[PDB]
Design a protein around this ligand. Structure first.
Ligand SMILES: [Mg+2]
Ligand SMILES: [Mg+2]
Ligand SMILES: [Mg+2]
Ligand SMILES: [Mg+2]
Ligand SMILES: [Mg+2]
Ligand SMILES: [Mg+2]
Ligand SMILES: [Mg+2]
Ligand SMILES: [Mg+2]
Ligand SMILES: [Mg+2]
Ligand SMILES: [Mg+2]
Ligand SMILES: [Mg+2]
Ligand SMILES: [Mg+2]
Ligand SMILES: [Mg+2]
Ligand SMILES: [Mg+2]
Ligand SMILES: [Mg+2]
Ligand SMILES: [Mg+2]
Ligand SMILES: [Mg+2]
Ligand SMILES: [Mg+2]
Ligand SMILES: [Mg+2]
Ligand SMILES: [Mg+2]
Ligand SMILES: [Mg+2]
Ligand SMILES: [Mg+2]
Ligand SMILES: [Mg+2]
Ligand SMILES: [Mg+2]
Ligand SMILES: [Mg+2]
Ligand SMILES: [Mg+2]
Ligand SMILES: [Mg+2]
Ligand SMILES: [Mg+2]
Ligand SMILES: [Mg+2]
Ligand SMILES: [Mg+2]
Ligand SMILES: [Mg+2]
Ligand SMILES: [Mg+2]
Lengths: 82, 118
RNA sequence: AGUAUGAAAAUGAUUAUUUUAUAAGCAAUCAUGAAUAUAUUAUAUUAUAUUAAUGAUGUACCUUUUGUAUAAUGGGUCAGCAAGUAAUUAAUAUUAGUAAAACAAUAAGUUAUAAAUAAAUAGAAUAUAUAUAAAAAAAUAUAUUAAAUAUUU
RNA sequence: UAGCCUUUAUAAAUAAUAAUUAUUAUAUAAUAUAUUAUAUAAAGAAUGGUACAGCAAUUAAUAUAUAUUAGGGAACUAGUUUUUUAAUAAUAUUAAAUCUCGAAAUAUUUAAUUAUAUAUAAUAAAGAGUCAGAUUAUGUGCGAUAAGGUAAAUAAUCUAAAGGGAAACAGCCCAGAUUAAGAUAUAAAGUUCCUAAUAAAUAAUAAGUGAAAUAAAUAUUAAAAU
RNA sequence: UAAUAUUUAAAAUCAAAUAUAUAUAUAUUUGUUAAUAGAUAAUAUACGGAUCUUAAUAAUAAGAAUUAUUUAAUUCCUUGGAAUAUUAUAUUUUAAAAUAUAAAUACUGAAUAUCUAAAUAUUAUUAUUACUAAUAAUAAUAAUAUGGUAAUAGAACAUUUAAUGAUAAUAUAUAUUAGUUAUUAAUUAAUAUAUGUAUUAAUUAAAUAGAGAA
RNA sequence: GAAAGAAUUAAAUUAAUAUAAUGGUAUAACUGUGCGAUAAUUGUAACACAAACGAGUGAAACAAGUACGUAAGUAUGGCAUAAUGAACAAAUAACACUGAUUGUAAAGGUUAUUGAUAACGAAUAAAAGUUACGCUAGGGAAGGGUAAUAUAGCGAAAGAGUAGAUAUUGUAAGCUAUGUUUGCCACCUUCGACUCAACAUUUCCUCUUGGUUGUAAAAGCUAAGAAGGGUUUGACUGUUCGUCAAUUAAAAUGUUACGUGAGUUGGGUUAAAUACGAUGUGAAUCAGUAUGGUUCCUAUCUGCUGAAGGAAA
């Protein structure tokens, strides 16, 4: 099992301890998404910054590349070279 | 002196937003707990779906999470009172109360349990 | 204050295009009609350029400040001139030359090649051996140093 | 000078940051009244004396047809009773910057584990700038629980931060602008028009109360509950 | 049920909900007044302003823009489904009735995030081009980063002088206008003025090397 | 069942601690006693705490000697935290370290010790005033905030009022409003007179009204509405103010940079002269007194008073 953790609020204006925590969590920027293995420590960490973060449990994680692929919009065209 | 035009009440919209935020916080906690439970299940020797199904879901052991789960310490939004969603206990106000929206970073800060009689 | 030349700007008059006599504020930016000008591919239902219909947005610039639209400093405009340089040294770095030597090679000298001590006639085999200092018969103890089939630092 | 910043680099380098495990008890199961495993509860290794809470000791305050110690006044024949005066004792109640017997959270903080390595720490060789800060919120001292006052503490922002909101706005609320583009999520704030965007439900208000800066004691009128 | 004297309470009590064994018990959570007066100064009313409180008879139609508690039609069960209702549309049937469909994801809102391209730097993968090829140049893919005063670091351009140096009046230099290249610069075309013509391109060396701030 | 011993438990604690306050302390550091005057000794001190540096603090261990102790051991002064001062220049001893031609010396050094810079990181061995005759560089390293005081108002009502709190009065305490006083803060660097006034209402007069054993009337007192009109001339003083005089229906209180100095004046008031009193040794000084005594401006824009031209009627 994995947590999908998103930074939904900016760290700007938040006490430095909390910023540090967020950094540790591997969350770089607002809207950034991380997939973390579920162990108690991680959960505890997340609890502390709960008001900054949106979490959801998922079956499997995703590599950044996969995520990117998922994101990509549908280009509504098929090229043909002539 | 310098005019900080901030009202003593909140607009309905603001209140709604606050409520939503509260709900979201609760949801995060719930999700965390769920994740922990499913991890436990997996450790024991079950599938993901099976874990999800399970009647006897495991409570969390870590202190903080447990405390959060307790509604005495950290109420959920439906449980919570009107008087605590939109006001905090101020030790130096008139009525010993103050609109939450006055609290510095109220949009990030969580603060549910005011004192028992205040 | 040489002689030529001079479509450099600020500044004045005038003419053309355009906008302007019910409209209010750094005079711009973005949106957006209309009018005019030019264009040897405007084929046009064209393209550029100019122009304060009209709408939205928009507290000059510097300085000094906790902080300036400030009714704090400074400037009438334009043109020209106006401010981190040199000498003699020292220490670090980078690259090049040479290298257990380097520079200079007339002889000197400078730095490196041995650490230490106020100074003195003292001074180097994994360290637990050794060197110097305080101490001492000699060790210990403290500090710093040197020391590991080979080719010295 | 240290603190905060930068450049180059070093490694028998993960030391850095964050959390978790660590304790106590209950139930169940298994081994020898003990040990392990699983579950559950408990503000859950160690450090602490603020809030709160308390009146113990210390320092203060109150009340007794209570008890004792003496005194003042009083009756009858020095003894006696009552009315007390103060002190001490008893019982009850109370508070405090320099009282804490109970006692939080936040905090300091340890080893291992997990996560952060396009990451953090340490060290080496070089450089700086800064040493009249401001506001907001919280807990204070000074002031008069005055000040856009003053002095420090903690956090943020401003300083050095443009953007959206707060009518206008350094310091508030959100959010950190490499350059565009403008389809999709949105933050704080809003949705009759000005002005981008709205429809509902249940109550209350009749004063324009109120509608982004709440003015007090008190009085009147009504409404509920007993 | 009238009058009667307080209180403005969910602590207690009752009701409802959630968690534990569970039709009960235990523990936790939530639910208890409103007007008016009091009310007040000097350029001008001062919610930012307009303005906002609804009503039969009639509108394919308004009904707070205030205060309190809420929702994203309303109700139930556990994001979903169902029912109910509403609106809109279509078709059939006699302006109605029946059938089917859709809507129920409220919306706006930043220079936030994503998408969509572009630039730069770094880390990790490539592809092409050319004999520290373990390199360089260019192009991809994934990721992270790109506000900034004092300050530190790195890289360029303009101007002028010295070293080297082709070329040419169809050339050059300077100017104006319109183009071009991610553009303090240079280049293209037309035009005007020089000038028998670069201290010209480029690499070095240097600087009286860049001005709205005295 | 008794005696004795060993004790143990409770209370220990504000006694005592060389000395303030705090923390500690009976397992005693507190007290008594034997021995001893020795650890109130000598070289190396790692490593910590603390910390800008200079400094400070605890301290294991190694070596040399000493004291007490049967022994284990304990002692590098004091139960802990204050009890202090750099370098430089002098001075005294030890060291055998250099000895400017050599030898001696002198002089310097090493080790140990001495006296102070209390403005206590100490500018020199050695240092006070005044300037209104002053000058240079700079900085700002009445308004705004507050409302303690002031004024004004309310709520409650002790008490006055020939009786009776509430006609009229209204202690001390309460709750407010104003920003007209005296202050506080440090964002920011002139009083009067004349002229002209504009605005406010918490109304002095005039208009309407309620209460008034304290409205017989007339005069009043007090309160509500009301800002339309009006609200003074002299002697004194620089005065605003204030004391009088004469009037008046009344001679209200403010705000306007305590309105108005690019509109006037300059009497007061912060310069140069001089004098008096006071203070100072003196230069000089003053919450003193007195005579004299210095700024100017043609109006660009806003605005206002008038007067035209253009214009879309
Ligand atoms: Mg403001
Ligand atoms: Mg500004
Ligand atoms: Mg000027
Ligand atoms: Mg420095
Ligand atoms: Mg305290
Ligand atoms: Mg200083
Ligand atoms: Mg301040
Ligand atoms: Mg600054
Ligand atoms: Mg900003
Ligand atoms: Mg910042
Ligand atoms: Mg950015
Ligand atoms: Mg209103
Ligand atoms: Mg208001
Ligand atoms: Mg007004
Ligand atoms: Mg409004
Ligand atoms: Mg962005
Ligand atoms: Mg940058
Ligand atoms: Mg120059
Ligand atoms: Mg110039
Ligand atoms: Mg410039
Ligand atoms: Mg004591
Ligand atoms: Mg002793
Ligand atoms: Mg030190
Ligand atoms: Mg001195
Ligand atoms: Mg001194
Ligand atoms: Mg002196
Ligand atoms: Mg003042
Ligand atoms: Mg004022
Ligand atoms: Mg009146
Ligand atoms: Mg004037
Ligand atoms: Mg003037
Ligand atoms: Mg004369």
């Amino acid at each position: 099992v994995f947590y999908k953790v998103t930074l939904s609020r900016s760290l700007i204006g938040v006490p430095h301890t909390t910023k540090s925590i967020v950094k540790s969590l591997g969350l770089g920027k607002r809207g950034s998404i991380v997939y973390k293995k579920v162990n108690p420590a991680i959960a505890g960490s997340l609890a502390k910054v709960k008001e900054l973060v949106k979490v959801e449990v998922t079956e499997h994680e995703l590599t950044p590349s996969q995520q990117r692929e998922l994101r990509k919009s549908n280009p509504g065209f098929i090229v043909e070279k002539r | 002196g310098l005019l900080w035009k901030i009202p003593w009440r909140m607009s309905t919209h603001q209140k709604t937003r606050q409520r939503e935020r509260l709900r979201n916080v609760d949801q995060v906690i719930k999700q965390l707990t769920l994740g922990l439970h499913v991890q436990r299940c997996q450790d024991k020797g079950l599938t993901y779906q099976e874990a999800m199904e399970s009647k006897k879901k495991y409570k969390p052991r870590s202190k903080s999470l447990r405390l959060l789960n307790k509604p005495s310490v950290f109420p959920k939004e439906n449980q919570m009172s009107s008087k605590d969603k939109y006001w905090t206990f101020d030790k130096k106000a008139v009525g010993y109360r103050k609109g939450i929206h006055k609290v510095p970073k109220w949009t990030k800060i969580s603060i549910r349990k005011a004192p028992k009689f205040f």
